[PDB]
Design an enzyme around this catalytic site. Structure first.
Site, mmCIF file in Angstrom:
data_model
loop_
_atom_site.group_PDB
_atom_site.id
_atom_site.type_symbol
_atom_site.label_atom_id
_atom_site.label_comp_id
_atom_site.label_asym_id
_atom_site.label_seq_id
_atom_site.Cartn_x
_atom_site.Cartn_y
_atom_site.Cartn_z
ATOM 1 N N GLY A 49 0.804 -1.209 0.000
ATOM 2 C CA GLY A 49 0.000 0.000 0.000
ATOM 3 C C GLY A 49 0.835 1.255 0.000
ATOM 4 N N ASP A 50 0.171 2.396 -0.070
ATOM 5 C CA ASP A 50 0.845 3.683 -0.039
ATOM 6 C C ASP A 50 2.046 3.806 -0.963
ATOM 7 O OD1 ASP A 50 -0.859 4.631 2.232
ATOM 8 O OD2 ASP A 50 0.163 2.969 3.248
ATOM 9 N N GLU A 51 1.990 3.144 -2.111
ATOM 10 C CA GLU A 51 3.098 3.233 -3.045
ATOM 11 C C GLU A 51 3.037 4.547 -3.813
ATOM 12 O OE1 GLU A 51 0.828 0.899 -2.786
ATOM 13 O OE2 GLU A 51 1.689 -1.112 -2.823
ATOM 14 N N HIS A 96 -5.789 7.480 -1.279
ATOM 15 C CA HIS A 96 -5.027 7.905 -2.447
ATOM 16 C C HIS A 96 -4.896 9.418 -2.531
ATOM 17 C CE1 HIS A 96 -5.768 3.861 -4.733
ATOM 18 N NE2 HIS A 96 -5.083 3.719 -3.612
HETATM 19 N N1 LIG Z 1 -4.572 1.965 1.677
HETATM 20 C C1 LIG Z 1 -3.918 1.110 2.467
HETATM 21 N N2 LIG Z 1 -2.578 1.225 2.562
HETATM 22 C C2 LIG Z 1 -1.916 0.372 3.348
HETATM 23 N N3 LIG Z 1 -2.384 -0.630 4.093
HETATM 24 C C3 LIG Z 1 -3.718 -0.724 3.976
HETATM 25 C C4 LIG Z 1 -4.540 0.085 3.212
HETATM 26 N N4 LIG Z 1 -5.866 -0.311 3.335
HETATM 27 C C5 LIG Z 1 -5.814 -1.335 4.154
HETATM 28 N N5 LIG Z 1 -4.543 -1.651 4.566
HETATM 29 C C6 LIG Z 1 -4.128 -2.757 5.427
HETATM 30 O O1 LIG Z 1 -4.945 -3.867 5.125
HETATM 31 C C7 LIG Z 1 -5.124 -4.676 6.320
HETATM 32 C C8 LIG Z 1 -6.586 -4.968 6.553
HETATM 33 O O2 LIG Z 1 -7.306 -3.740 6.799
HETATM 34 P P1 LIG Z 1 -8.816 -3.512 6.222
HETATM 35 O O3 LIG Z 1 -8.640 -2.978 4.808
HETATM 36 O O4 LIG Z 1 -9.469 -2.493 7.142
HETATM 37 O O5 LIG Z 1 -9.516 -4.863 6.277
HETATM 38 C C9 LIG Z 1 -4.433 -3.926 7.449
HETATM 39 O O6 LIG Z 1 -3.169 -4.526 7.747
HETATM 40 C C10 LIG Z 1 -4.368 -2.501 6.909
HETATM 41 O O7 LIG Z 1 -3.352 -1.707 7.471
#
Ligand SMILES: Nc1ncnc2c1ncn2[C@@H]1O[C@H](COP(=O)(O)O)[C@@H](O)[C@H]1O
Ligand SMILES: Nc1ncnc2c1ncn2[C@@H]1O[C@H](COP(=O)(O)O)[C@@H](O)[C@H]1O
EC number: 6.3.4.4
Lengths: 430, 430
Positions: free
Chosen positions: B15-17, B44
């Site tokens: 994520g966050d790339e 984003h």
């Molecule tokens: N945009 C995002 N960027 C980074 N990690 C994310 C992002 N959305 C969800 N996560 C990760 O995805 C996992 C599950 O979270 P969730 O999307 O709430 O089910 C966790 O470890 C979050 O930190």
């Protein structure tokens, strides 16, 4: 280049289109035959030399000994059923299967209590709204719910530390028992068998992503993906909620095997000459009458397990065109044409009318689909036997016209005409 | 031919790339910009002329007025959040958005109690095993579990008979309350708002399958699919269960929009010069130290909402190569290169070692990943400022060598070098 492209066989209606028939035909040589989505409820019947088969979890190619049978990560496995299945075919003359099979360490496990809850859930929705899904009661639905919640367990967890496993297996059991406290669970009992399965499994398991990558980017190979269930049973695109819980559509091949779209080649859509459905839900062209009894009879449309007959109806181009929009079939396999041999006239649905006016597209809401008037087109029957045809010329006129009709209205070429149940009973148009 | 092919932007790490950055750049002209999987937790960030944006559910292209913003069926929506989001940007100078937006009647609804249960579930796994997912607590996980069970509701159900809706909405609420009887639900309260949303929504909703079909088979168009979350957070291929509940990988584009693989064109993989992760789970190259504090600092790696800093680590080619195997990137966008401007030496992970021996592939079991020794390769830093570069020649030697290193070890061409945060801060290599 980018490697070898896979060949996909998908159901275009509501299941039982005769997918096993097309898979088995296409696998005869194929290096790899795989399964990408769904569980042990595929019901893919294969007839080869007066020897009939009923595969549910094992790829329809498990027969071919030269080829390797693969189960992708998108599949859900209820181990007991797996072995129960292999052993029933093991008796029909199937040996050494366990040596040409490979399981993806990322696939999910259907636990005994999962199949349990399915039943409860079904009977619950039964005595409350007097209407349920029509499930096969094999825990597919609850296993997938567990998967989404990230509380379910995978093949790779079963092989790892059985101590960290058991703990999780315990909590998941207790969670489900909160959905239905009436549900009992022989905790250490099932855990017992499970570990036995572990050792029985270990030799077949591998990393699926790596596996499929090697095959598609190494030397050229022929890979066959066997779709399960069908287009209109798709959790996303089917007549929700009267659907199964996996992407039976083309996308599931990518998500279930871990391969990119550019590695997807020919995507064949299996179409049955008429329409069937097992379970609750709309069926515009359903024919609860003489005709429906006839199709159901001549086409042996009944539960290959429970003997439950399937609802039968005329071919319906609405669902077919809708399916093509999502799967992008490169060609079609039209099956059970012979079933129509005896009819004088054959009707086929061309569109839907809600309140005298023609609807523009396949309705998302299944409830709407239950109120549409079907606009049919009546076609001349060939009133003759086709079971012996083996080339485009053998089929009589109206027969050929019927194939063209499907071809034209879907805008997709029919590459196969199923006119019987045996391997030899196909007719490759090109 | 087969129509217009879509262009896909996907996250290649955790994520966050900097996906918003690549989307916004690619959308500037694009006819359609869409969202295919996940919920309102994309985060984003888009910077265009000293005006920063934080989109979570709305496509990063909602800005461009000439283009149409689309939300596919694979997406899960929590209406409240939707409007809350549009209004926050509505204040940053965003008007008429509601006229260039289109929602897929097949997408699922995240209900208030869904976000509720997420929290309970998280805190529960918290005070029991002293370890949870690290969720964003936005009900994505429970909404998807509902979807799989076929008990969740869709956009098309909300617009239909609000009487048949309410009934189902009631039962689902009672079901969740059985998972956590401590959960309270303002039934008629939420139902109240919901119907208000219905009328607010109705004008933007359409049939997604039909919609996307028209666009890809009608006259040539440019469609942009904005992936959410990332490769290693993929419910199927990520470090399960420390993942989100949707297919963030290429397959999800097919399953989420209803389009076939052959309609997928360029699939761009966004790669950040270093690695980050928010939430629990393995992170081989994590750098809890001076360096990690530095990356986290110079790269502003913190919750754009809660201020929670993300774990920072060196670039890790293991996860990158694994991601490519699944998404089949046609090119890469390397972001935040400038963040490395100040380091004398830069380390990057080339492989994993479990017990002195090099592992062959990315391990399915996340627990194993927590025990690997990382084999690094130390590279020379360019020790200079790159924020002003705007062409391949401007970047100093070691900088270029770093880009090549990534290119070479992934076997995928880097088409973009993010060297700043503004639109203009990219460098198109070709
Ligand atoms: N945009 C995002 N960027 C980074 N990690 C994310 C992002 N959305 C969800 N996560 C990760 O995805 C996992 C599950 O979270 P969730 O999307 O709430 O089910 C966790 O470890 C979050 O930190
Ligand atoms: N192989 C199949 N052929 C036809 N219908 C099926 C098949 N597998 C599942 N279904 C239908 O899919 C729906 C959900 O059942 P399940 O797969 O048990 O969740 C029901 O309406 C079933 O009848």
């Amino acid at each position: 280049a980018t490697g070898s492209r896979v060949t996909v066989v998908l159901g275009a209606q509501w299941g039982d289109e005769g997918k096993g028939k097309v898979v088995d035909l296409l696998a005869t040589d194929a290096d790899i035959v795989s399964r990408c989505q769904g569980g042990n409820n595929a019901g893919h019947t294969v007839v080869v030399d007066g020897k009939e088969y009923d595969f549910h979890l094992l790829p329809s190619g498990i027969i071919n000994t030269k080829a390797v049978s693969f189960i992708g990560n998108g599949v859900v496995i209820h181990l007991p059923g797996l072995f129960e299945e292999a052993e029933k075919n093991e008796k029909k003359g199937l040996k050494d299967w366990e040596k040409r099979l490979i399981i993806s360490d990322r696939a999910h496990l259907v636990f005994d209590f999962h199949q349990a809850v399915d039943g409860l859930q079904e009977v619950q929705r039964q005595a409350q709204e007097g209407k349920n899904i029509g499930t096969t009661k094999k825990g597919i639905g609850p296993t997938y719910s567990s998967k989404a919640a990230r509380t379910g367990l995978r093949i790779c967890d079963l092989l790892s530390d059985f101590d960290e496993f058991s703990a999780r297996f315990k909590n998941l059991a207790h969670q489900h028992q909160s959905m239905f406290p009436t549900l009992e669970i022989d905790v250490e009992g099932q855990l017992k068998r499970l570990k036995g399965f572990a050792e029985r499994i270990r030799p077949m398991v591998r990393d699926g992503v790596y596996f499929m990558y090697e095959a598609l980017h190494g030397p050229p190979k022929k890979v066959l993906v066997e779709g399960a269930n069908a287009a209109l049973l798709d959790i996303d695109f089917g007549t929700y909620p009267f659907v199964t819980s996996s992407n039976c559509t083309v996308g599931g091949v990518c998500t279930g095997l871990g391969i990119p779209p550019q590695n997807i080649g020919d995507v064949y859509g299996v179409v049955k000459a008429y329409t069937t459905r097992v379970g609750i839900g709309a069926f515009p062209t359903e024919q609860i009458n003489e005709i429906g009894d006839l199709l159901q009879n001549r086409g042996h449309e009944w539960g290959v397990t429970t003997g439950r007959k399937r609802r039968c109806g005329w071919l319906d181009l609405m669902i077919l065109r809708y399916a093509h929009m999502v799967n992008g079939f490169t060609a079609l396999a039209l099956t059970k044409l012979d079933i129509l041999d005896v009819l004088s006239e054959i009707k086929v649905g061309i569109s839907y009318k809600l309140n005298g006016k023609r609807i523009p597209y396949f309705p998302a809401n299944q409830e709407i689909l239950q109120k549409v008037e079907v606009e049919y087109e009546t076609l001349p029957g060939w009133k003759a036997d086709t079971t012996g045809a083996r080339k485009w010329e053998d089929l009589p006129p109206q027969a050929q016209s019927y194939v063209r009709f499907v071809e034209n209205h879907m805008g997709v070429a029919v590459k196969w005409v199923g006119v019987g149940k045996s391997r030899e009973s196909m007719i490759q148009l090109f």
